[PDB]
Structure formats: C-alpha cells, structure tokens
C-alpha cells in the first residue's frame, strides 16, 4: 500500500518543479505555465505526460499505470490545491458556472467562522468547483494493446488502443453533480453522480431544516448543477490485428469534457484511457456474481495514420516547378505507367475552389471514372487513394449498398432515441469516395451517386427516414467496359472518364514485367531519379494546397472560351462535350493553380487541364 | 469465524492420489513435462488426459467423472501444490490453478440433445456449434476499497457461487464504512475475472432430420472466455449443473441447467500439427535428398484415387502451398493465393478433386453454386435485436480466411455472387458496411472452383470463350483455368477403367473382413470418440492394392500434410535470374505471335498473369524448400501457365 498524502506531495513537486526547453529551446515550466493559465481560466484540459513524469519518477508512472483512476484524482486534487497560489489576477467571469462558483466561495467565506469544524458532508464537493479537468498521455514505453486483448486482467489500468471509429453519439449534457434547492431553509444540496443512474433526493438535509424539523422538500434543478460534455463512441479493431477468421472487435469509449468532438465515425484513432467497469444491476442475472460492463474512459484521443490533425526543405520543394510531377509520380509509385491517370488522381485529391455566385453552388469537387480492361490496377489505384486521402471511403460492388452508402436510422442507448447514422457517402462527406464496380453497382445506389455528384446531397423520402443529407465528396469510380460499354449516363456526369486499354506490346510489357518483378523482389518500386514522397508528406502538401483558393483572372476568359468552342467544334465534327466539360476545364485549371500554390490560375494550368482532358477523351478511341 | 474442516478423509485421499498422478516423474514424466511447459508458457490451466488418469487410477477417474466439483477442487489443490513445489514464486503469483479434462469419455461424451438431467454434477464432453456468444464481462472476485475519512484500506472477497447456494451477505458491495464514511474503490488494486456465456447447439448434420435443434448454455471464465465465436464446431468439456434461482418463497421446481466449461477445443484439423524430432528429421531428409523432383512426386501423390490430370494436380499443389503476400511499406498489398477454376466435360472427377482439397487442406469451406447466396457467401450485417446495434456475421470466404473455398457449380452460381466475390478473389478481403457499422473483413482464401461448360458438355469445335460463359473480368482473376476434357481415347479409357476398378476393389486391411458395411446409425458416433477433435508416422505409403508396383513410392497422407504445413511457412525470395526469365516469358506470352494458329486463349493475359507466374514459381520454391525462387521454379511456372492458358480448337 501507499500513502496518498505522500503521493499528492510527489505530484505537487513534479507539477511545480518540472521544466522543459520546449519553447524555442528556452527553459520553461511546462506545467507551471499551464497551471497559471487554468487558474486564470484560460485553459480547461491539463494533459499530464507520463513520459515527462517518468523522466524523474518512474515508480510514480508505474503506480499511475496500475491504478490510474486513483492517481487521476490525486493529480486533479493537487492541481486544485495549487491553483490559488498560481492565480495572478481576477478572472472575468466568462461563464455562468464561474458566476456560481464565485458566489459559492464568497458566501462560504462570509459564513466561514474559520476556527469552527464543519461536518464532512457540510461542504462543497470537489467536482462542483473545478472548471478544469486532468487527463493523461500514456507513456511511450507502453506498447498499445489490442481491443480484443484488453480484458478483465487490465481493469483500472491505463492502456492505449488504436482502431477505426464506427459509431459516435452526439455531445449531450451528462450530470456530474446534481444541485437541489430547498423550499424551507434556503440552502443547497449536492449529489455527486457516479452511477449511470441516480434517484433524485426528496428531503433537504441542511442544518436549518434539520433543526426546524420541517418538511424540507428540495427541488432538483439544472441551473446550479454541474454538467460535462459527454459522448459515447464505438471503436473497432484494425483489419491487420484481427485474428485469422474472426471479425473485428468493438470497444465502448466514454468521452468527457474537452476530449469531445475530436473523433468522428470513420476516423483512425488512438485512444488512451482507463479500462473501467460499469455495474450491471437491474437485469435478472442468470449467473450469480457482480457482473459489470467494460469501457475505456477517454483521456487522450489522437487521430492517426490517415487523418492526423513548415521547413525550409519543404518550402524549397514547393518552390520547385516540377513539384506537380513529383507528387504525381509519388501517387502509387509501385504502379508502372499511367502517368496522366495519376496526375488526374492528384488533381482529384486537391480539388477546385467552391463557388457561390448569387444563390447557387458550383462545387469544386473533381469526379473521375476509371474504365478499363481487367488487371490495369484500377482497384489498386482506388485503394491507394483511399489510404492516402484524409476522409476516404472505399466501397466495393454491393457489400456496402443501400444504407451502406446512404444514412439509416438506429435506436440509441444513451437516449434510446432514433439517431440518423451516415453511410459511406456521409462518412466521406468532405473527402473521397472510391466506388469500385460502379457499373455493376445497384440501380438505387447508382442513382444516389448521380444525385451526390449533381448536388452533393442525398435526399431520402422512405418510411423511417425523411431527410436531406450532405455528402460533399469527390467520386472516384472504377468501372469496366461506346467501345463495348460506355454509357452516356457516365459521360454526362463524370468530369474525367478515363479508358485504360492494355494492348499487348513487347517493349512496354517487358518494362512492366521488370517493374513488377523488382517490386516482388524488394517490396518496393524500382529506384528512380526522384524518391517518392511519404504519405504523410503527400497529405501535408495536398492539405496546404487545399487552402490556397486561386481565382480566375478575366484575362483568361477569352482563352478558355476559345478552347471550349474549339472542343465543341471537334466533338460536333467527330463521331460528347457540354457546359459540364467547360466546368471540368475550369475546376481542373483551378486545381492545377492550387497545386502550384498561386492565387491566380495561368495559361500553363489551363493547357495542362486541356491536355489531361484530351488524353481522357482520346483514350476512348 | 466459522466451521473449518480438520480431517476430511475423502479430500485428503483425493489430494494424495492427484499429487501422485501429477508426480509422473517415474511414469516418463508426461504430466511433469506438461506442468513445466505451462509454467514456462505462463499458463494456469492444466489439461489432463482422462484416459491417462483412468490408466493410473481408475478409481480416481470414476470419482472425478461422477463427482465433478469436489474432485476438480481436490485436483486443483494438488496442481497448485505441485506448481509450488516445482516453482514457488509462480504458484504465489497465480491464486488458483484450474484443471480441464480431455480424452475418451465412455458415456459422458454426449451432445446437447442426449445431455439429460442424468449428467448433473458430472463431467460431460459436449460437441456442437456455437449459436451465439456474449460480451466478455469482468466479475469482481476481490474488491479493494479506500476510506478517505480514515485512510483505511479494506479488501472484500467474493466466492464463485455460480452453482451454489448464495445469500445476500456474500454479494453485497461495500459502499460505506462502519461509521458511514463513503468509500472509494481501487479498480487497479481490485481483482476481476473475465466471464462469458455461449450457446452450443447440436450440429445440424448430426441432429435428427426434420426436428428442431437442442441447445445448451455454457459458462466460460478466465482463460477460456474467447475460445470460440458463433459458428464454431466446438467440443466443450465441463461440469453440468443446475443454476440457482432467485430467493423466492414459492418454487415451481424448475431448474435451469448450464455447463461450466473446464476446457474448450476447436476442430483439431486446423490445430497446430505436432512435429516431433523424428518427424522434423524425416522432413529434412526428404527435402534434402529429393529436391529436383520433389514437386512432381508430391503432385502425383496428391490424389491417388483420381487418375491422370497431372497438370491440374500440380496446379492444386501450387494452390495448397500458396505464394507469399507482398506487404509494401506504403500499405499496398499483393495476394499470394492462387485461384484455380476447373471446367470441362461431366464425369472428369473435378468435384472429386474439390472434395479431396476439402478433406485435406486446413480451413477448407465447401460451397455450391446456389448453396450460398451473397450475404451467406461473403460477410453479412445484421442487428442484435436486443441492443439495437449492428453486428457482423462471417461468410464462407471469411471463415475460409487463410484457407480454401471449394466452390462447385460455379457456372450455376448467380452472376451477383461472382461479382461480390470478385474482391475476395484478388484483394482477399470483404468490404461491407451499413449505416451503423463498416468493416473490411480479411478473407485471404484461395478459390478452387468447378463448373460445367455451356451446353453441358464441352464443344471441341467452338472457341473456349464461347464454351465458357464467364466474361473476361471474372476469368482474369482466376490464376489458372483448366479445361478437363473427357477424351474418348481407347487407351486412356483403359487406364481410367483399370484405376477405377482397382480403387473399387480395394478393402481396408484388418477393419474390413470382406463383407462388412461400415455405416453406423447415430449412436456409435457418440459411443466412440469423435474423430474430429481427437489428439508414429511414416513417409512413403507401403505397397498395396492402390497401385501394382514400380520404382516410385507414394507419399503418405499424414507425411504430405506435415510437409505441406512446414513448406507453406517458407517465404522463398525471388532471384534476379528467375525475375528476368519470368519477365521475358511474360512479354512473349502476352505477344500473341508466340502461340501457334488454330489456338484460342482460355483466359486473357494480364499483369495478373505475370503475378500468377510469380506465385507459381514461389510455390514451386516452397515445395522444394528452396527459400529462393530458382530457374527450375520459373520454368515450372511458365510451363503450367502456358499449358493452362491455351487450348487447340479442333476442326
């Protein structure tokens, strides 16, 4: 056993006398400055890094990792005790709960009588007067665990897991301390809520009412109470860590306070928290014993590995004029050839600028459909784009169909209500939806995709659901074969319809075979003049481009009009082109300008857009 | 305090006998070695063979079988004492060492139907299929509380009164001190035990036809909770007992029964094979002495009962050995699984080859064209109906992950199902999703399909494209496509008939006396041990009626299984010479001018053709135990693909 007063002193010592050179090499009191901030009420969440703690006290780290809840409370109490001596001015009462705390403290001081001893229950609860919250950051030496392996043997421990977020409730107020006011005396009563349910009190235990022996019925109310942002999410194992034949395992994660609104369904996250049980009374327990649920209380949520939330080297790399080609060649380096296809995919990943001229939106998303023979790496390209893009949903033929693409309605648990859960399109709302086997996809699904392309929304008027969803995603379809199957339905919608025909050819086939065989030899593409960018770098560059909206100067108006009219004449003479093609020109040029990271598009961007468009068009022939 | 036994003669005798049995040092230390192995592996459950227990002391065996709880407690005490004697620190680390049972249960081996109330408080080994499972919940076995007001630290213990009389006193969780001081539980210090409840249903192929199935509820605890998932053909050895009802005042006399599992086992076919020193030495000897023709020997010894089809047999061996997956740093994946499609004339033993693969290859799932329809074939998304949450059900492909799916009547299979499995055939994964859930299940299975050509029988005078109604998109992902023709050559008919008649005239030595009918009727199966979860091996099959004679032996089935299991783990690396040879051969193959006239391609040539070339070379390397893909391996791969991809159009 351990003396928790000594432990509190240890954590106080650490929190006060820990320093680091984080701030531009200058030595800083990492936690002292944060304590000052949240004593001024400028910060709410205090993330104690257990690596920092272990830097000088490994045993404290082990004790925390073994009984995290106890030491979580110890750290919170130490912070609360230290705040007054770190406060350096009066807070501006930014919150009504701050007003309540001010009034409570002032009245306690007014009726202090310092020498008198008040009963243990005649005092404000700790949680009622915190206005802050202390979380951990798991020590790096703790290997992340598998949701399947997180079992009863590690209840109350601090563990970190990684997985895909499947279901996430909304943020709703969870009572933490229920405040009641009496109708006789005029005191207050505080019930700290710990169980999932509580029975509201009826009789006021205040001293005045106890002396009067009066009724003292008290009224529960939300004004003086203490709520906390609450959320409940389902976190799913990663495909690579599931056993041979099993299905991925889920875990329930309860998120509170400032950890809320971090993760959203579809995100790849790492969550560090304490594995805690919930008592399971109420049911007709078949087997005797105190059985309980299990959940992870979220202390640190970190989006990772697909949607993580500069340097002179990268600035120079951007300044390079061949940065466009560098990124293109970096898109799926293993895939040999398909240079223009990969450039189009990069333009897809970047996207054009959204327009809102006088009450109608011309979305900047780029829609690409890869028609091709078997074995031309369309599936590989779509899978790579899924792994690369931040919000990417890769939907095959019919496994994710109907409500697998559109939202449905499911009963809730926190509220028992009917909540609207998004499908693949909504999960990729503002990213990339890689549709595979688009030709073989169902008719209702195809119509939904057409509607999302034309409007970025999904209207539903079925029985249990009646809503107008929002899915501002870019469609990357991969169909197979007017050649032999070239629907005008696809032509009229897809901004870039690419045909990938692989005619046999000794030289090209031999080069591709050498590429493939080296790939199988060394688990990597053959070395080239330019090393391909790592996915993190590609995502960073693309994201920086995304917020670089370039405009179209009026000088290029006549050039664009001439190119469009020339293409119209060529199409009319030959054996499809329209305003959709013109808008494809505009948004491809805008995306090229954005890639170059300028504010104004140029004739070079327009020419490249036209070149890619003509390559796609003559791929048909 | 309370009553404390001093001289329990039966308990003392049971402990003495169990410790004597577990000593085993003079009895070739079988259980001594098992205890040492579990100590090293950091396990606290000893699995004891009831047959060995009965051989040592039939009295103890009968007492244990007929009195489960008492004898199991005595056995666990003896095991804990033995573990302390061998190593005290480990014994102190683990509070209770459990004992599960295994072996041949004469009468106690039953099914959920035959499991009647006559087996209460006995050890029963019940077979079945897990119809459902429950979430693994922790039950507190020792709670720790801290009182801030007094700084005291108390610890309450709860006994395992699952099938014993329980009172409110034992199951009250302290929430105040004797002076009404609120407590706070130390979750980290507290001791929890994982607990799960599953349902075992009688196997449909074993249940009486046309009747509803019989189920039983099973309780799993620490170290057995996640030993099974829905759809698992499991053998649960446990204690059958009546679950206490809630404190009443009026009782109807009805008692829910349950099986407290002491051991859970899956199908032993998928279990890790036992490789003894002599077995591994024999494998080494085989691989080293014979490497040049080892692949051919294995291919010809694969299915003795099916004559001919040498190339198809070699392709099936390559499929069994598999290739090697490529896990690129950027996440791109390349499957190492060979897909084979046998199409051709009726009565060419294609279904027999598929059945042989089903019987031999581990994790082999049978399937029929219309037997599985979409959601049944791939994974499916349903709802719990009690929680309102989505749930995933594994399909045939998912269950066959890291295995084989043997599909028959592939042509009869609806186009929708083939389109659905397209992804599995190449990416080896199932991508399903509904509104409340989305997953990407792993289905890394090789597809071995059989089909009948359009018009029922193959048309020698029509293109293979027209004979096979499968379009190029589906044909390409099939690594090999073999057309098995029922040629009417008199000499081939002679050979086939001779082989068939010899196989028919064979009788098993010893078991068959010349007139026996081996079929049993629904009783002997339970009477004798199941040959599906059961526990010296030669190398070359002794000469028998299967073949007449020659200077070439046939590989034993068990030896071949062990050799294939060992060789599948090998990941031979592609050499530069083989890489160049394969690249040039792929270029030539794709260039149509290489192949002669009057020759039509069975399936189109593609990057996937190159990939299957590489995979076949890798499989040949695995067969050779080479660890490097060599020129001979590349030659065999190119030979096989060249034979498979072209068929001469007769006229």
């Amino acid at each position: 056993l351990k003396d928790y007063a000594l432990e509190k002193e240890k954590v106080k010592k650490f929190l006060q006398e820990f320093y680091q050179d984080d701030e531009l090499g200058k030595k800083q009191f990492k936690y002292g400055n944060q304590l000052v901030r949240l004593a001024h009420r400028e910060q709410v969440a205090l993330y104690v890094d257990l690596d920092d703690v272990a830097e000088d006290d490994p045993e404290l780290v082990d004790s925390i990792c073994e009984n995290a809840r106890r030491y979580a409370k110890l750290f919170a109490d130490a912070v609360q005790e230290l705040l007054p001596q770190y406060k350096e001015r009066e807070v501006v009462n930014k919150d009504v709960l701050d007003v309540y705390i001010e009034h409570r403290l002032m009245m306690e001081q007014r009726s202090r009588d310092p020498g008198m001893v008040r009963s243990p229950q005649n005092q404000y609860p700790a949680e009622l007067m915190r206005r802050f919250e202390l979380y951990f950051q798991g020590p790096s030496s703790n290997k992340p665990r598998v949701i399947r392996e997180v079992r009863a043997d590690s209840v109350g421990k601090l563990v970190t897991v990684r997985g895909i977020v499947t279901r996430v409730s909304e943020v709703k107020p969870k009572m933490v301390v229920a405040t009641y006011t009496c109708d006789q005396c005029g005191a207050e009563t505080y019930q700290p809520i710990q169980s999932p349910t509580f029975m509201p009190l009826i009789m006021c235990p205040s001293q005045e009412c106890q002396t009067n022996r009066s009724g003292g019925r008290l009224y529960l109310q939300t004004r003086g109470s203490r709520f906390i942002k609450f959320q409940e999410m389902k976190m799913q194992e990663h495909s690579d860590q599931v056993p041979v034949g099993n299905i991925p395992r889920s875990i329930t994660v309860l998120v509170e306070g400032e950890n809320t609104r971090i993760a959203q369904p579809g995100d790849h996250v790492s969550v560090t928290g304490i594995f805690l049980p919930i008592l399971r009374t109420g049911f007709r327990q078949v087997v005797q014993g105190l059985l309980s649920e299990t959940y992870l209380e979220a202390h640190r949520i970190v989006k990772m590995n697909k949607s993580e939330d500069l340097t002179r080297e990268e600035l120079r790399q951007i300044a390079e004029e061949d940065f466009y080609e560098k990124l293109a060649a970096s898109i799926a380096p293993e895939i040999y050839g398909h240079e223009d296809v990969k450039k189009a995919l990069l333009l897809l990943l970047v996207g054009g600028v959204d327009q809102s001229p006088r009450g109608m939106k011309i979305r900047g998303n780029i829609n690409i459909c890869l028609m091709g023979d078997p074995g031309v790496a369309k599936s590989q390209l779509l899978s790579y784009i899924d792994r690369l893009a931040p919000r990417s949903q890769y939907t095959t033929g019919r496994g994710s169909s109907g409500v697998g693409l559109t939202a449905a309605v499911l009963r809730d648990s926190v509220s028992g209500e009917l909540t609207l859960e998004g499908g693949a399109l909504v999960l990729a709302d503002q990213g990339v939806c890689c549709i595979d086997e688009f030709d073989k996809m169902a008719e209702a699904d195809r119509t939904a995709i057409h509607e999302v392309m034309e409007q970025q929304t999904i209207s539903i008027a079925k029985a249990g659901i009646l809503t107008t969803l929002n899915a501002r995603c870019s469609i990357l379809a991969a169909a197979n074969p007017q050649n032999i199957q070239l629907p005008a339905a696809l032509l009229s919608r897809f901004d870039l319809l690419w045909l990938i025909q692989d005619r046999p050819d000794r030289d090209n086939d031999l080069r591709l075979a050498q590429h493939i065989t080296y790939v199988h030899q060394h688990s990597r593409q053959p070395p080239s003049q330019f090393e391909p960018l790592d996915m993190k770098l590609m995502r960073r560059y693309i994201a920086m481009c995304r917020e670089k909206q370039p405009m179209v100067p009026e000088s290029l108006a006549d050039y664009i009009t001439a190119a469009y009219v020339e293409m119209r004449r060529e199409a009319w003479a030959s054996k499809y082109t329209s305003a959709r093609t013109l808008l494809a020109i505009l948004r491809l040029s805008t995306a090229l300008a954005r890639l170059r990271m300028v504010d104004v598009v140029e004739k070079e961007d327009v020419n490249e857009a036209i070149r890619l468009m003509e390559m796609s068009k003559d791929s048909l022939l | 305090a309370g009553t404390v036994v001093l001289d329990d003669v039966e308990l003392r005798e049971a402990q003495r006998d169990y410790l004597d049995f577990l000593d085993d040092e003079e009895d070739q230390g079988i259980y001594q070695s098992k205890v040492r192995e579990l100590i090293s592996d950091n396990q606290y459950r000893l699995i004891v063979n009831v047959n060995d227990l009965r051989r040592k002391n039939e009295k103890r065996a009968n007492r244990l079988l007929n009195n489960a709880f008492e004898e199991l407690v005595a056995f666990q005490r003896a095991l804990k004492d033995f573990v302390a004697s061998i190593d005290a620190t480990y014994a102190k680390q683990y509070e209770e060492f459990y004992v599960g049972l295994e072996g041949s249960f004469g009468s106690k081996h039953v099914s959920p139907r035959t499991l009647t109330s006559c087996f209460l408080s006995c050890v029963v080994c019940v077979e079945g299929i897990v119809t459902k499972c429950s979430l693994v919940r922790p039950k507190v076995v020792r709670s720790v509380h801290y009182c801030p007001a007094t700084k005291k630290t108390i610890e309450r213990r709860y006994s395992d009164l699952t099938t014993l009389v329980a009172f409110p006193s034992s199951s009250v969780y302290p929430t105040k001190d004797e002076e009404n001081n609120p407590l706070e539980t130390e979750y980290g210090l507290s001791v929890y035990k994982d607990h799960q409840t599953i349902t075992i249903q009688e196997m449909p192929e074993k249940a009486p036809a046309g009747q509803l199935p019989r189920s039983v509820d099973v309780i799993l605890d620490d170290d057995l909770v996640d030993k099974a998932k829905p759809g698992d053909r499991v053998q649960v050895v446990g204690t059958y007992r009546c679950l206490p009802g809630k404190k009443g005042g009026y009782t109807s006399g009805t008692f829910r029964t349950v099986l407290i599992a002491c051991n859970v086992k899956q199908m032993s076919k998928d279990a890790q094979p036992s490789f003894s020193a002599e077995d591994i030495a024999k494998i080494k000897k085989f691989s080293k002495t014979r490497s040049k023709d080892i692949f051919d020997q294995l291919a010809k010894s694969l299915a003795p009962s099916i004559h001919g089809h040498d190339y198809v047999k070699k392709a099936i061996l390559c499929l069994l050995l598999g290739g090697v997956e490529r896990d690129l740093e950027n996440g791109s994946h390349i499957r190492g699984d060979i897909n084979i499609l046998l199409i051709g004339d009726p009565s060419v033993a294609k279904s027999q080859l598929l059945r042989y693969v089903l019987c031999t290859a581990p994790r082999a799932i049978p399937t029929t064209g219309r037997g599985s329809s979409g959601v049944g074939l791939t994974a499916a998304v349903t709802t719990d109906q009690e929680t309102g949450e989505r749930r995933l059900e594994a399909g045939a492909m998912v269950l066959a992950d890291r295995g084989v799916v043997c599909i028959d009547e592939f042509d009869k299979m609806s186009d929708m199902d083939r389109t659905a499995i397209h992804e599995v055939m190449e990416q080896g994964r199932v991508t399903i999703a509904k509104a409340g859930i989305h997953a990407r299940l792993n289905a890394r299975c090789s597809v071995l399909a059989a089909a009948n050509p359009v018009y029922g029988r193959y048309d020698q005078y029509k293109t293979p494209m027209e004979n096979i109604g499968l379009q190029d998109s589906l044909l390409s992902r099939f690594d090999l496509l073999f057309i098995m023709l029922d040629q009417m050559d008199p000499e081939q008919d002679r050979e086939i008939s001779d082989h068939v008649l010899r196989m028919h005239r064979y009788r098993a030595p010893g078991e068959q006396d010349g007139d026996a009918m081996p079929l049993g009727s629904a009783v002997d199966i339970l009477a004798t041990d199941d040959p599906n979860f059961s526990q010296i091996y030669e190398k070359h099959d002794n000469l028998l009626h299967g073949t007449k004679k020659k200077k070439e032996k046939m590989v034993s089935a068990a030896f071949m299984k062990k050799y294939i299991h060992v060789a599948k783990i090998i990941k031979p690396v592609l050499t530069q010479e083989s890489a160049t040879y394969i690249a040039e051969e792929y270029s030539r193959l794709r260039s149509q001018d290489s192949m002669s006239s009057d020759t039509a391609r069975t399936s189109p040539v593609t990057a996937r053709t190159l990939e299957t070339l590489i995979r076949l070379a890798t499989a040949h390397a695995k067969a050779r135990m080479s660890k490097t893909v060599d020129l001979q391996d590349a030659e065999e791969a190119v030979e096989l693909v060249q034979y498979a991809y072209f068929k001469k159009v007769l006229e």
Binding site: - | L120, L164, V165, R241, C242, P244, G245, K247, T257
Partner: protein, 49 residues
C-alpha cells in the same frame, strides 16, 4: 426455521434458500397434442391438450 433454538435470537422470517447442488432433478418435457384430423367433427376446430 426448524432448528431447535438454543436461546439465541431466532433465525429470520424467510430463512430458506434452495441448495441446487443438493437436489435430485429429473427430465421433464411438455408436449402439445391435437385431436386427430379424422376424429374432428366436420365443421369444428381441432381440440388441443
């Protein structure tokens, strides 16, 4: 409680709990039987037991 009290406080009002271990249980099945179709009068729903 039957126990011959020795002058202590008497056992509680409803002190008895079933000991599932110390019980003799037997199989028991519930069947539904229907009036034979021929035995049913012409216009009459079959009886059940």
């Amino acid at each position: 409680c039957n126990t011959d009290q020795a002058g202590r406080p008497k056992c509680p009002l409803d002190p008895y709990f079933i000991m599932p271990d110390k019980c003799k249980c037997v199989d028991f099945q519930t069947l539904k039987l229907q009036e034979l179709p021929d035995a049913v009068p012409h216009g009459e729903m079959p009886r059940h037991m």
